[PDB]
Amino acid sequence: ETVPVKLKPGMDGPKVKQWPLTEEKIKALVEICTEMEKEGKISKIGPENPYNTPVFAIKKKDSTKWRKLVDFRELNKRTQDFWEHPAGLKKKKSVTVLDVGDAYFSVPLDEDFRKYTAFTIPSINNETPGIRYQYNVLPQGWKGSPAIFQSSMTKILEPFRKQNPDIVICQYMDDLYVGSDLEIGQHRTKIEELRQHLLRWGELHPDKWTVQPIVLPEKDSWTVNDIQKLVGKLNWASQIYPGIKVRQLCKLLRGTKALTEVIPLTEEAELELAENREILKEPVHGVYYDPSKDLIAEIQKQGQGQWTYQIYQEPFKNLKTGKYARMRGAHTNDVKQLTEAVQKITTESIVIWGKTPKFKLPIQKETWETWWTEYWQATWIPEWEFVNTPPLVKLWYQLEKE
Amino acid sequence: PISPIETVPVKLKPGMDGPKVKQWPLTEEKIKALVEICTEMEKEGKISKIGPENPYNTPVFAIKKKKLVDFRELNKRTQDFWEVQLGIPHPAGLKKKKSVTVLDVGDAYFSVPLDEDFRKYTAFTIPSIIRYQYNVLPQGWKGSPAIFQSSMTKILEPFRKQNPDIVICQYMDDLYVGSDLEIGQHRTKIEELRQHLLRWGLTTPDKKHQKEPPFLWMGYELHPDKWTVQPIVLPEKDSWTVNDIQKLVGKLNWASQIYPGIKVRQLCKLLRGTKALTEVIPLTEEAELELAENREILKEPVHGVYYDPSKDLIAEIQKQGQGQWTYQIYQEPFKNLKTGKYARMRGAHTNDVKQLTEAVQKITTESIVIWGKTPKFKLPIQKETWETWWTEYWQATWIPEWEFVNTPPLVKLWYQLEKEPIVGAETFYVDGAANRETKLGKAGYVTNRGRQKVVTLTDTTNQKTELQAIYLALQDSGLEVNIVTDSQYALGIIQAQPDQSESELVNQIIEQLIKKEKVYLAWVPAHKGIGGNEQ
Numbered sequence: 022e023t024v025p026v027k028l029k030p031g032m033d034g035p036k037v038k039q040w041p042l043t044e045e046k047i048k049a050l051v052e053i054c055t056e057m058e059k060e061g062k063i064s065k066i067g068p069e070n071p072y073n074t075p076v077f078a079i080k081k082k083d084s085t086k087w088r089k090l091v092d093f094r095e096l097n098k099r100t101q102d103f104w105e106h107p108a109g110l111k112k113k114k115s116v117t118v119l120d121v122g123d124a125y126f127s128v129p130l131d132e133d134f135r136k137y138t139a140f141t142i143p144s145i146n147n148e149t150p151g152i153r154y155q156y157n158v159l160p161q162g163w164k165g166s167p168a169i170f171q172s173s174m175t176k177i178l179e180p181f182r183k184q185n186p187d188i189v190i191c192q193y194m195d196d197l198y199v200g201s202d203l204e205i206g207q208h209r210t211k212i213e214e215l216r217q218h219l220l221r222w223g224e225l226h227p228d229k230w231t232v233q234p235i236v237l238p239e240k241d242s243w244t245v246n247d248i249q250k251l252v253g254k255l256n257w258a259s260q261i262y263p264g265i266k267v268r269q270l271c272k273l274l275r276g277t278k279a280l281t282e283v284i285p286l287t288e289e290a291e292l293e294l295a296e297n298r299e300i301l302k303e304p305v306h307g308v309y310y311d312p313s314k315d316l317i318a319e320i321q322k323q324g325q326g327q328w329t330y331q332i333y334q335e336p337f338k339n340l341k342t343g344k345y346a347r348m349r350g351a352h353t354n355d356v357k358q359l360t361e362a363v364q365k366i367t368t369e370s371i372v373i374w375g376k377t378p379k380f381k382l383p384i385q386k387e388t389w390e391t392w393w394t395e396y397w398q399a400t401w402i403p404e405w406e407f408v409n410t411p412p413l414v415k416l417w418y419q420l421e422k423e
Numbered sequence: 424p425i426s427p428i429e430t431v432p433v434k435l436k437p438g439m440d441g442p443k444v445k446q447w448p449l450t451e452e453k454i455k456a457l458v459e460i461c462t463e464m465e466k467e468g469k470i471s472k473i474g475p476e477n478p479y480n481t482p483v484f485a486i487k488k489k490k491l492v493d494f495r496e497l498n499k500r501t502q503d504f505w506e507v508q509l510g511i512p513h514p515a516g517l518k519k520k521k522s523v524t525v526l527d528v529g530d531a532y533f534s535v536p537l538d539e540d541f542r543k544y545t546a547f548t549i550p551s552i553i554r555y556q557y558n559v560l561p562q563g564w565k566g567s568p569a570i571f572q573s574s575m576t577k578i579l580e581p582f583r584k585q586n587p588d589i590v591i592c593q594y595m596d597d598l599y600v601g602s603d604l605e606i607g608q609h610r611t612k613i614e615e616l617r618q619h620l621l622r623w624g625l626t627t628p629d630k631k632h633q634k635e636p637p638f639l640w641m642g643y644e645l646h647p648d649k650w651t652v653q654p655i656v657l658p659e660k661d662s663w664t665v666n667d668i669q670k671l672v673g674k675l676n677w678a679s680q681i682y683p684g685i686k687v688r689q690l691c692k693l694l695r696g697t698k699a700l701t702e703v704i705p706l707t708e709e710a711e712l713e714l715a716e717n718r719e720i721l722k723e724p725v726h727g728v729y730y731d732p733s734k735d736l737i738a739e740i741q742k743q744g745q746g747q748w749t750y751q752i753y754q755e756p757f758k759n760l761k762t763g764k765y766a767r768m769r770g771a772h773t774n775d776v777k778q779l780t781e782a783v784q785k786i787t788t789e790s791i792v793i794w795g796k797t798p799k800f801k802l803p804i805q806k807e808t809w810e811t812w813w814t815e816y817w818q819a820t821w822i823p824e825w826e827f828v829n830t831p832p833l834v835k836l837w838y839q840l841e842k843e844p845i846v847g848a849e850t851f852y853v854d855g856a857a858n859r860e861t862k863l864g865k866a867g868y869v870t871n872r873g874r875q876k877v878v879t880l881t882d883t884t885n886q887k888t889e890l891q892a893i894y895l896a897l898q899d900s901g902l903e904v905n906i907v908t909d910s911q912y913a914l915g916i917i918q919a920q921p922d923q924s925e926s927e928l929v930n931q932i933i934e935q936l937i938k939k940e941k942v943y944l945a946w947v948p949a950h951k952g953i954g955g956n957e958q
């Protein structure tokens with residue numbers, strides 16, 4: 022059957038433009054869609070349908086096969102919320118993700134909602150009008166899909182949830198997250214076991230990331246410049262740790278000495294510093310994850326394939342922070358790196374709070390939109406805006422535990 | 424000439440109803456005119472005729488071709504459909520064919536069936552000094568196009584499938600068919616296609632009554648193996664008006680893409696201060712010399728070729744000046760597929776390199792539309808230059824496979840701030856401040872070498888001062904300088920090695936920066952105890 026679904030009141034179907042695609046991707050898509058058409062999963066539509074959603078194709082990791090991807094961000098934003106989170110995986114030793122997008126195709130979609138899922142396969146040089154379709158089943162990448170399939174999902178897993186109430190399983194979108202403390206040996210087998218349990222009907226390490234300290238410089242001899250830079254970082258720091266003191270230091274900096282000038286540290290100053298090092302040894306107090314408010318992800322490009330991020334719902338009250346060292350292959354590609362980055366981070370938030378954060382990407386919209394798809398690999402698409410990395414915030418996070 | 428294709432289901436925007444506007448009285452010569460013409464449309468396939476039911480009057484005036492309607496209201500109340508023509512096929516994306524024919528499907532609108540439950544919402548009225556409705560897509564109606572296309576689209580599917588080596592392109596009430604079949608072979612399929620479209624009510628012209636190459640396009644002259652920039656020439660004028668120049672400068676601009684070398688800086692001049700569009704402007708000698716010299720250029724047209732899937736795509740770029748770039752895509756050297764130019768301005772910061780980057784990005788997407796591929800790039804920039812630049816820039820940047828080309832002028836980095844203080848180099852502690860409200864401030868410096876300076880500034884802001892401080896420092900300082908400052912805003916600006924701004928002032932600094940041997944810029948927190956920034 023199929024349960025009636027609706028858009029939140031007042032709202033209407035997405036009418037988002039199709040970004041142009043590469044031939045390679047188009048052929049792939051056309052192929053995919055035609056097959057899916059035959060199977061009756063989707064159907065060509067007419068002009069009376071004025072809605073549209075972007076689509077593209079991405080080859081999965083360790084796969085040479087083209088996967089069709091749709092951006093229902095807008096649509097999801099508009100579909101009625103359905104009111105239907107584990108702290109386990111958060112703490113688990115190891116987690117693996119499962120793509121159950123297929124599950125969804127089995128189930129049909131309310132006929133009256135189908136219109137909204139209209140999407141468009143573009144043609145090169147505008148030579149031919151585009152190829153328009155709409156789903157007949159529950160589409161992948163739709164928030165309504167996991168919801169309507171929720172029920173069936175449970176029973177499907179029960180026999181394992183019961184056979185293994187020692188393991189955890191959180192579902193999010195076309196994703197299935199599972200984490201145990203068993204060694205990768207007895208682990209992969211249970212995963213692959215479960216995996217089979219599913220095929221029947223038809224790594225990660227959460228214990229290694231949370232937040233890091235702000236290591237501070239430490240030299241033999243300090244020059245005016247050195248001292249200044251330091252003071253700069255601290256002052257800003259104080260915003261998180263109001264206990265941070267910078268007087269003793271700021272004294273040494275009195276006069277108009279050349280930057281290169283070397284300066285000896287007041288024993289008074291040494292204490293000052295010492296006290297700040299002490300403080301900065303641990304994440305500040307009073308940081309709570311509020312679920313009523315949105316989760317934020319700031320990312321700074323540190324250069325040399327280096328990238329630093331902070332997740333927070335409120336400024337200077339990060340919940341987590343980290344670094345990310347580019348993967349051998351992006352030897353010269355910033356966009357590749359950033360994407361990968363963005364990806365990990367989203368993935369983590371899911372694990373943690375099982376909820377996607379909104380990004381603040383240090384990159385032109387133009388750039389990001391011409392290529393992001395070309396490196397993307399995930400059933401989901403987070404929210405994002407583009408910004409101008411404030412020079413301060415960088416010099417600060419550049420100072421992370423190395 | 425009716426079609427047996429199933430109508431598409433059309434609805435009125437939810438919550439709204441068919442029109443009710445009034446018909447405006449007409450001459451008797453126009454009454455008896457529409458009278459005996461409608462009588463036609465009726466027996467045929469178009470109109471019906473109705474009475475007191477479905478009171479959706481719609482205006483029906485008449486004008487001769489030295490019947491007709493107006494649905495403006497209806498349209499308003501009709502739903503929305505899909506994007507009919509997200510953009511036009513640009514020549515460079517075509518492949519050469521052996522033979523091309525275009526079939527004008529004129530009154531194809533009127534050949535397509537309308538949605539019955541909708542026809543209703545179409546009504547007439549013809550006062551005899553006589554009321555109809557529609558049953559087919561009517562000229563001027565919101566959905567006629569989107570629907571007619573779609574209809575056409577289906578009708579073609581089988582054929583397209585059966586005759587795959589035949590490329591049909593739909594545009595408005597026109598069909599563009601190409602192929603690599605020898606002549607007679609082609610003619611035959613054309614009729615096969617033509618008689619196919621007729622097995623559906625959409626009647627078309629006989630080969631005896633068809634259009635012949637070359638064909639005119641988006642300003643192009645098209646041949647089956649070559650396209651030619653439809654040569655163009657400006658008018659010789661005795662009295663130049665405002666509007667005139669505007670239009671000229673416009674038509675001139677279009678051209679500059681194809682014929683880079685065209686200029687208009689001195690014509691654009693003519694517009695400064697114009698009082699009215701119909702105004703008549705004198706012609707600077709510099710202005711004449713440009714017109715003439717531009718006309719010389721617009722003489723010899725441009726020859727070109729199409730896209731060969733077999734060959735790879737090459738895009739090469741040159742900097743026609745600061746922020747103005749020229750590019751040409753091709754496969755066989757000098758066998759241009761496309762050419763173009765971009766000339767962008769900016770904000771408080773930019774640099775050739777990033778600008779070069781933006782050109783590249785554009786070209787790419789442009790290419791992706793035209794060829795679904797991105798070309799290999801030939802960029803007037805040294806790999807090292809690029810390398811040292813991007814690896815350090817704060818924003819994420821990239822360039823698809825590109826390769827250097829020593830085709831000066833090359834885009835380079837006009838300067839680079841030191842990464843550490845310069846030993847044995849003066850150290851200036853600049854600082855600037857001005858009273859927000861009263862545009863008047865001061866900004867000066869003081870070095871370790873005890874040199875000092877401060878100027879009063881009548882009419883200014885804060886940042887103007889800060890930046891100024893820095894400018895000063897730069898002016899009188901020497902090839903090697905250390906500059907500490909507390910300007911959050913200033914930091915970023917300079918930091919990002921800009922080589923061109925909107926602010927003369929910033930530019931000021933840029934020159935200065937360029938001039939020095941080594942410059943280290945340092946930022947320190949504001950209003951704390953930090954020396955220099957204290958005195």
Ligand SMILES: CCOc1ccnc(CCNC(=S)Nc2ccc(Cl)cn2)c1F
Nearest residue numbers: 517518590592599600601638645646647
């Ligand atoms: C005025 C050109 O008409 C067309 C426009 C767009 N598309 C087509 C069909 C595609 N034909 C191809 S690959 N190339 C092609 C080459 C030369 C000429 Cl004159 C027309 N078409 C056309 F025939």
